[PDB]
Amino acid sequence: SGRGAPLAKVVFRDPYKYRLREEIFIANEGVHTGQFIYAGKKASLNVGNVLPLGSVPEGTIVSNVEEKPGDRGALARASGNYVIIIGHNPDENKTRVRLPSGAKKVISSDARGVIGVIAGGGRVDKPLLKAGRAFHKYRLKRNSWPKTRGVAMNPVDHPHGGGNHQHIGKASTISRGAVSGQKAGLIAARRTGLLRGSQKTQ
Amino acid sequence: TPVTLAKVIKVLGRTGSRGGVTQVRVEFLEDTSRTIVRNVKGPVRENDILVLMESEREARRLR
Amino acid sequence: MRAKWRKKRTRRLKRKRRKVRARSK
Amino acid sequence: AKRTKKVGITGKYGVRYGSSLRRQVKKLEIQQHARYDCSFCGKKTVKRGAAGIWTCSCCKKTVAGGAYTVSTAAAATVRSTIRRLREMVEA
Amino acid sequence: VVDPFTRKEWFDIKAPSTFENRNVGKTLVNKSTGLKSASDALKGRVVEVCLADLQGSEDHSFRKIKLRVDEVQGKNLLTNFHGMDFTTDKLRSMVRKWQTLIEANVTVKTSDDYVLRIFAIAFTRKQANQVKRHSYAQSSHIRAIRKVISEILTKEVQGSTLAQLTSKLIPEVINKEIENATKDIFPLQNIHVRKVKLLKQPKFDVGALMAL
Amino acid sequence: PKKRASNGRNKKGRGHVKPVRCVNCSKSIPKDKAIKRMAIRNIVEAAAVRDLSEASVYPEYALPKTYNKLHYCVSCAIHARIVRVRSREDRKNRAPP
Amino acid sequence: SQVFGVARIYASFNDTFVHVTDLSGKETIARVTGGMKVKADRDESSPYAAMLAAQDVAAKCKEVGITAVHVKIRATGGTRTKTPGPGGQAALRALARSGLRIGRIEDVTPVPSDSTRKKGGRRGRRL
RNA sequence: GGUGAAAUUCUUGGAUUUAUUGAAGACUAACUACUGCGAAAGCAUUUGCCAAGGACGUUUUCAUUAAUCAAGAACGAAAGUUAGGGGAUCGAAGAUGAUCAGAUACCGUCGUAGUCUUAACCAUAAACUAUGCCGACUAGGGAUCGGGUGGUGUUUUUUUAAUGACCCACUCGGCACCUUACGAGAAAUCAAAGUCUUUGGGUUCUGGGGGGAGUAUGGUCGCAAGGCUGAAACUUAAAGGAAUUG
RNA sequence: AAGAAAAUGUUUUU
Ligand SMILES: [K+]
Ligand SMILES: [K+]
Ligand SMILES: [K+]
Ligand SMILES: [Mg+2]
Ligand SMILES: [Mg+2]
Ligand SMILES: [Mg+2]
Ligand SMILES: [Mg+2]
Ligand SMILES: [Mg+2]
Ligand SMILES: [Mg+2]
Ligand SMILES: [Mg+2]
Ligand SMILES: [Mg+2]
Ligand SMILES: [Mg+2]
Ligand SMILES: [Mg+2]
Ligand SMILES: [Mg+2]
Ligand SMILES: [Mg+2]
Ligand SMILES: [Mg+2]
Ligand SMILES: [Mg+2]
Ligand SMILES: [Mg+2]
Ligand SMILES: [Mg+2]
Ligand SMILES: [Mg+2]
Ligand SMILES: [Mg+2]
Ligand SMILES: [Zn+2]
Ligand SMILES: [Zn+2]
């Protein structure tokens, strides 16, 4: 509930006690029930396996990537999202990766990730098409919907409120150094207007 | 100042937009077993001694 | 006038005429 | 008889929400409700549960897939890339 | 104001184990210091040196050899085979019009651990009494020739180590074998093994490195 | 009327030929219509073949040649004098000079 | 008896590079261009500028300890020219005349098995 | 770096160049040709799988089952549209630099859409050989692609020979070419554009001086851009084709 | 190898 990507329940044996330990992975697309998942440094490069970032070749696509060794997954967890291994640094062992947003990050080679892409991709390509469907989407996430426009409020309620016409009144670009209650609008905007140009700035 | 002199052994032809220079196949006085083509603007004939600032400079035709 | 650009001008005139026709009823 | 000319599945939406949005919803709903070939038992019995989950009514195997189709182009490309890298590593 | 070449020390490359001659030349690198070792700066360098310069015989003016540094032993860079390539001038001279060019390539693992891709070329030629002025192939014979060449290369590699494949490439016996096995299809004047590319190296294994 | 009997190109029985780019101006021209001249030029002439031979360390080096196939558009070929306008009778002579 | 380096004459149009390096190519020795020798913004490709640059590079090579160079000539290559500029020839001749020994002439102009789309549009530069 | 020359731009946070690796997407050089295949648009890396096809060979089979075709359909370059993927290069728009009298143009540096791909549309090109398809006949000549037949044929090893390549002769089919035209045409030119006032082998489509005009209106297809069908009022003595001399 | 600029010209009559 509240998550676009499905979860995969994976049962491991406890190496130190006779019992089973069940873990809740985020299922990578192509993983099926009854499949054997191999997690560790010596696991093979198959979809669904969990390997340290330093043990995979360049260009590998991974998911549920650790920012630090042992934090159990922080990056590329939403549906359809993935991280690409773009470089290795054997001395001072680090792995360069490209994040879903396009940012370049340097992670320890001991951090782990799951081979493949997060399942459930293409979810946002379907129009919600109904206020009710948006209602049920956020009903299972948090109380952040619906949103009243700040200009539709009174001056006591919001920086944008008031006036005989609905208008901001002052520049909606807000400085990063603003204080709480002033940060309404576009915070620390480098630019505004319809985006014309490319991504992946040099 | 580098010193080198040569002697024209053959006249190639007139050259330049206005025909002002002439191309000469010219053989160095010292180390005569070495020949280069040069551009000279004044009136020349065969068997004329010229003085060169540089030795290694291929003179090309003037379009 | 080049026939290609005359064709383009005629196409523009046709769209304008159709739009005015639709604005009228 | 053919009951609707072009709306198909989105005929339940009436005249609301706009033709273009209804068209996109038509495409993705047809994908979402189509029946698919099982890769394990060889039957056309794989249908979607919740988003991203595709269960076969026969042999009861469940596979993680796309939100509205069993296998996305992204996952096909990733499978090809991982196969190439795995073959390079083990060969 | 810096004059960086005073802080550089010279090394001599003892490149091969088996071609003809150990000494191929010298390289320079900064003097090893606390945080940037000369051995680390080296050991990744690749030198492309002519097989004619290896063998002393001018009939190897093409077929350049790639050798990358593996180890440092007292100002001596021991290398090993990294790849082989024809020269651009030789390749362009072989490529001529009014004849069919045949190109084959195979990916194969050597006998011990090495993964290589072999690029072989061949060219159609006229018979001695031929009157027709182009002598083209019918592309089914081309398929058969490519199959034969691929089989020959697959047999010659993977039954021999990297060193044995080097010692087999130098005398060019694979070319004669391809000639013999493809003569019954077309004359094929110009069989050559134009390129050997190293795709994957095994673990370093300085033990077999120190075979020179 | 029709200036050239077949066409200003060489394509009969094909319909389409993949284009090539002019070396001089980068104009897109079909491979058959482009004026193609092969250059086998000695890599170092410089009126200095003997000079390089003297400086060489190998006896009888047998210096190489540089090979380059140049494809020209009609306009660039005419301007750079790879081809010249010919009379009506001279146009029908396909033999090289 | 001789110490070999690599000459690496890149003769583009509008400029020429004479790049003497070690046999490996990682360590460089006196990369000098005709733009370093003449200042007009147009003469970088002049054979005189190329000769001066090659002479300076060869002098620095002789002061560093290099005796001979294996020459690698290349043009802009890729998708643009494939034809050496006017200055590479003069650079080679000046290197030969400046006392350095010359060996193993090679053309290493990057020639694609085919190209990305060439610059200029389909109709090309219309001057 | 770029140009004829510039300038925008990058650059001692090291530009350009060199070396070792790696990734992504496009594409398939040279070989490549008056060469091949396809109904056309088109199709150029290897290999495998799947079906398809022409030419030839045939003392095989059926026996008129055929040609061309309104209505009706399948495919249909590029650009363009919709939704995903991908987005290296080039690059409508746009941003800049210069030139200019002006230059939101040519030239220069970026760069969105697009360029690639899947699923759908669109159905147009100087979609050209500006030459409908089927059939018969009328010159000479040499090449070349595919098949077949023959030879005291050359070369290749199997062990006599034989497939392979090659030479010569013949033949069917094909892309074309050279000469001359009996002939044709206004001519350019044409082996079909000939067999035509000595006018008839079969059949489909289209045109009737130039504009207005592929426009108005109606219909129809398309999301749209637009496609198909398609006038007249009115105006005009020329417009046009080939060739000749300046 | 390449090499800057160049817009305009009333009607009828021969
Ligand atoms: K307000
Ligand atoms: K220039
Ligand atoms: K793009
Ligand atoms: Mg909102
Ligand atoms: Mg609101
Ligand atoms: Mg209110
Ligand atoms: Mg307030
Ligand atoms: Mg405020
Ligand atoms: Mg004309
Ligand atoms: Mg066409
Ligand atoms: Mg300059
Ligand atoms: Mg011009
Ligand atoms: Mg190719
Ligand atoms: Mg062919
Ligand atoms: Mg019809
Ligand atoms: Mg301006
Ligand atoms: Mg497209
Ligand atoms: Mg049409
Ligand atoms: Mg037509
Ligand atoms: Mg006329
Ligand atoms: Mg006048
Ligand atoms: Zn099943
Ligand atoms: Zn051009």
Side-chain angles (χ1 to χ4, degrees), chain A residues 1-201, chain B, chain C, chain D, chain E residues 1-132 134-212, chain F, chain G residues 1-21 25 28-47 49-50 53-54 58-59 64-127:
Chain A
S1 283
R3 185 196 302 273
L7 308 174
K9 290 186 180 328
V10 180
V11 172
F12 293 88
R13 286 167 61 230
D14 198 344
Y16 312 105
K17 191 196 179 310
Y18 169 73
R19 69 175 159 199
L20 300 177
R21 305 281 92 211
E22 178 194 302
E23 307 278 2
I24 304 165
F25 289 5
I26 314 167
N28 277 4
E29 173 166 320
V31 172
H32 64 93
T33 49
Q35 185 185 314
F36 282 129
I37 301 299
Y38 302 103
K41 190 173 176 69
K42 283 192 171 296
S44 298
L45 202 75
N46 290 101
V47 168
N49 286 359
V50 182
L51 293 88
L53 286 200
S55 302
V56 301
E58 308 272 43
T60 314
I61 296 90
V62 288
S63 82
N64 203 7
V65 185
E66 295 188 309
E67 296 202 339
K68 278 141 174 198
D71 66 352
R72 306 176 82 180
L75 312 171
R77 294 165 51 91
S79 77
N81 270 269
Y82 69 80
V83 175
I84 295 151
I85 303 291
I86 62 170
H88 293 288
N89 205 359
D91 62 358
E92 65 183 1
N93 55 344
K94 287 274 185 43
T95 308
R96 286 185 317 284
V97 305
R98 186 177 65 246
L99 296 179
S101 73
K104 280 90 181 180
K105 201 177 178 69
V106 193
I107 315 188
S108 164
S109 292
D110 286 341
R112 303 168 299 161
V114 194
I115 311 299
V117 289
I118 300 277
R123 177 171 43 78
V124 291
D125 293 333
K126 193 171 159 192
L128 279 168
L129 198 75
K130 264 165 64 175
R133 293 202 179 146
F135 164 88
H136 290 299
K137 158 171 181 166
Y138 294 103
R139 177 172 58 96
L140 277 296
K141 297 165 150 283
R142 58 211 71 81
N143 186 24
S144 71
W145 187 94
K147 309 191 188 291
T148 309
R149 280 166 307 112
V151 289
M153 296 168 183
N154 285 311
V156 71
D157 285 321
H158 200 262
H160 296 175
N164 293 347
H165 304 278
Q166 282 201 11
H167 69 296
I168 317 290
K170 281 187 187 284
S172 49
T173 53
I174 306 298
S175 59
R176 179 82 72 200
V179 303
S180 299
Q182 292 187 324
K183 280 194 187 171
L186 324 175
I187 314 303
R190 293 167 181 91
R191 69 174 320 279
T192 51
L194 196 54
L195 278 180
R196 293 166 183 114
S198 296
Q199 296 298 109
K200 313 283 151 304
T201 66
Chain B
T1 308
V3 178
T4 175
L5 283 72
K7 178 178 72 173
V8 298
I9 65 167
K10 185 65 178 174
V11 62
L12 267 293
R14 286 316 185 113
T15 286
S17 185
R18 293 180 179 90
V21 295
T22 187
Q23 300 197 108
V24 298
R25 194 166 300 280
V26 75
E27 207 165 10
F28 284 92
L29 276 177
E30 285 87 6
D31 186 26
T32 290
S33 57
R34 175 60 62 86
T35 300
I36 61 170
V37 60
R38 293 286 285 207
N39 285 342
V40 298
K41 70 176 297 183
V44 309
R45 68 185 69 188
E46 53 93 24
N47 190 81
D48 267 2
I49 307 287
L50 302 156
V51 65
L52 311 178
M53 308 315 93
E54 287 77 18
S55 175
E56 305 321 300
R57 184 177 178 179
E58 289 289 326
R60 305 297 295 161
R61 191 181 57 198
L62 277 298
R63 189 84 275 163
Chain C
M1 183 177 177
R2 193 177 166 176
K4 184 193 280 285
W5 312 139
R6 200 185 282 290
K7 195 185 200 204
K8 183 192 260 302
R9 170 184 285 186
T10 308
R11 283 199 168 119
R12 293 157 155 169
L13 294 174
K14 198 168 178 177
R15 293 179 293 173
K16 176 206 199 163
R17 218 184 272 112
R18 200 186 73 238
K19 182 175 174 66
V20 185
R21 179 67 180 271
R23 173 173 180 77
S24 299
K25 275 314 180 192
Chain D
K2 182 174 72 68
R3 294 165 302 232
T4 79
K5 190 170 146 210
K6 67 184 289 184
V7 292
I9 192 66
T10 48
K12 62 180 181 293
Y13 293 130
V15 306
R16 314 180 287 275
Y17 319 126
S19 66
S20 65
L21 298 188
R22 270 192 274 110
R23 205 174 317 123
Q24 306 178 228
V25 172
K26 182 178 183 292
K27 180 67 174 66
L28 283 167
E29 276 183 350
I30 289 172
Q31 291 181 175
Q32 159 184 1
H33 292 124
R35 199 182 286 259
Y36 295 82
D37 294 322
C38 181
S39 59
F40 311 111
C41 77
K43 301 177 166 144
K44 190 174 280 282
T45 52
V46 165
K47 291 177 71 68
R48 207 201 82 165
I53 297 169
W54 301 83
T55 300
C56 198
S57 49
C58 203
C59 73
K60 300 294 187 291
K61 297 291 180 68
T62 302
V63 58
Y68 315 115
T69 175
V70 176
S71 191
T72 60
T77 302
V78 161
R79 249 193 317 271
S80 296
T81 285
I82 298 297
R83 191 201 44 93
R84 195 190 46 82
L85 286 168
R86 174 177 64 243
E87 289 176 347
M88 186 66 204
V89 165
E90 320 182 311
Chain E
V1 183
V2 169
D3 207 307
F5 300 87
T6 61
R7 62 146 189 290
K8 277 166 194 295
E9 201 272 328
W10 276 89
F11 291 69
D12 169 73
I13 302 149
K14 303 297 292 297
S17 303
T18 182
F19 289 116
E20 176 66 35
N21 290 318
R22 303 292 182 89
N23 279 47
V24 302
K26 293 182 183 293
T27 187
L28 72 164
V29 73
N30 287 5
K31 285 175 189 293
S32 52
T33 317
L35 61 83
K36 193 176 290 295
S37 184
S39 52
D40 306 320
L42 305 150
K43 289 169 68 71
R45 280 173 196 214
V46 171
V47 292
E48 199 177 49
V49 64
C50 192
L51 193 43
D53 307 348
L54 275 296
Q55 304 316 93
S57 192
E58 182 65 26
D59 70 3
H60 306 143
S61 55
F62 43 97
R63 294 178 65 88
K64 312 183 294 176
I65 313 290
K66 287 189 178 297
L67 302 151
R68 80 291 183 275
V69 177
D70 277 358
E71 195 187 1
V72 287
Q73 56 159 5
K75 314 173 153 62
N76 285 320
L77 306 183
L78 308 169
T79 62
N80 189 358
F81 188 79
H82 196 50
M84 183 278 288
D85 217 319
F86 269 45
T87 318
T88 65
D89 46 48
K90 188 67 200 302
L91 171 58
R92 300 258 76 81
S93 74
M94 294 182 286
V95 175
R96 297 270 326 278
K97 192 181 287 184
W98 324 115
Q99 70 187 40
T100 300
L101 172 144
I102 306 301
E103 271 196 1
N105 73 32
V106 292
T107 187
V108 64
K109 187 185 282 187
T110 72
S111 77
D112 52 356
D113 280 334
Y114 272 89
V115 181
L116 289 165
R117 192 141 55 215
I118 289 192
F119 296 96
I121 206 159
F123 298 85
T124 59
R125 67 156 158 107
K126 323 189 204 175
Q127 290 276 51
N129 67 322
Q130 179 162 344
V131 177
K132 197 144 57 52
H134 46 252
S135 82
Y136 288 132
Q138 280 192 345
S139 166
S140 53
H141 310 140
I142 295 178
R143 276 193 297 279
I145 282 152
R146 190 137 42 209
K147 192 172 183 287
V148 163
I149 293 180
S150 295
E151 293 176 325
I152 286 296
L153 300 166
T154 308
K155 291 184 294 179
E156 297 307 325
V157 179
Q158 90 185 0
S160 304
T161 80
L162 180 50
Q164 293 179 356
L165 188 60
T166 300
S167 83
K168 192 181 302 284
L169 283 173
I170 298 156
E172 310 196 335
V173 70
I174 314 173
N175 290 318
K176 198 64 58 73
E177 294 294 328
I178 292 159
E179 173 82 32
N180 296 123
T182 63
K183 177 61 184 174
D184 190 359
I185 305 163
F186 291 102
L188 290 198
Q189 54 181 319
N190 224 333
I191 294 91
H192 276 134
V193 183
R194 70 177 199 87
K195 179 155 195 180
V196 161
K197 198 188 285 201
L198 182 61
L199 305 186
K200 182 187 176 186
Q201 306 152 60
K203 299 289 94 176
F204 181 32
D205 186 74
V206 65
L209 172 63
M210 294 299 291
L212 58 86
Chain F
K2 184 196 273 167
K3 192 168 194 182
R4 281 163 191 87
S6 76
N7 260 317
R9 62 189 303 186
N10 191 346
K11 183 266 289 181
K12 290 203 172 196
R14 255 167 289 291
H16 188 258
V17 183
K18 280 180 184 174
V20 65
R21 304 302 295 277
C22 170
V23 288
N24 205 329
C25 69
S26 297
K27 178 172 175 63
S28 179
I29 191 152
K31 186 186 165 150
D32 62 358
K33 186 162 174 176
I35 294 92
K36 305 156 264 296
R37 301 299 193 247
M38 187 66 204
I40 319 288
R41 298 294 296 163
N42 269 332
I43 190 167
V44 60
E45 294 181 359
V49 161
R50 69 156 271 181
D51 190 324
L52 198 76
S53 179
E54 293 179 353
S56 170
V57 292
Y58 304 98
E60 207 71 21
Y61 179 29
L63 73 165
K65 295 175 181 179
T66 182
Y67 305 71
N68 185 17
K69 209 189 184 192
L70 295 177
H71 315 258
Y72 282 99
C73 70
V74 171
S75 296
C76 276
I78 292 291
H79 184 62
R81 294 185 251 270
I82 294 95
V83 290
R84 299 203 153 151
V85 170
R86 299 192 290 175
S87 67
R88 202 179 193 86
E89 194 73 13
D90 291 331
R91 285 178 195 132
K92 282 184 305 184
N93 171 252
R94 303 175 51 106
Chain G
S1 71
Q2 305 266 15
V3 176
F4 288 164
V6 184
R8 281 179 220 288
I9 298 89
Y10 180 75
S12 87
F13 281 78
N14 290 318
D15 187 74
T16 310
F17 286 70
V18 189
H19 199 179
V20 179
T21 76
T28 73
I29 296 145
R31 176 206 57 239
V32 173
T33 62
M36 293 177 70
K37 298 296 289 183
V38 304
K39 301 211 91 202
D41 272 320
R42 59 182 291 194
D43 298 308
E44 294 88 4
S45 61
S46 180
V64 167
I66 303 301
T67 66
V69 291
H70 295 296
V71 172
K72 293 183 183 293
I73 192 66
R74 65 180 290 269
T76 302
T79 63
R80 287 167 55 89
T81 316
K82 272 80 71 176
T83 295
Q89 183 62 255
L92 183 62
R93 184 176 178 179
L95 294 174
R97 291 297 290 191
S98 194
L100 272 60
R101 315 301 307 278
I102 301 299
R104 301 264 165 241
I105 314 295
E106 178 164 62
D107 186 74
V108 290
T109 289
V111 170
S113 300
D114 55 76
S115 298
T116 55
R117 184 162 178 79
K118 198 183 179 191
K119 185 176 180 180
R122 64 175 295 167
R123 298 197 275 147
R125 301 181 67 239
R126 308 175 292 284
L127 277 297

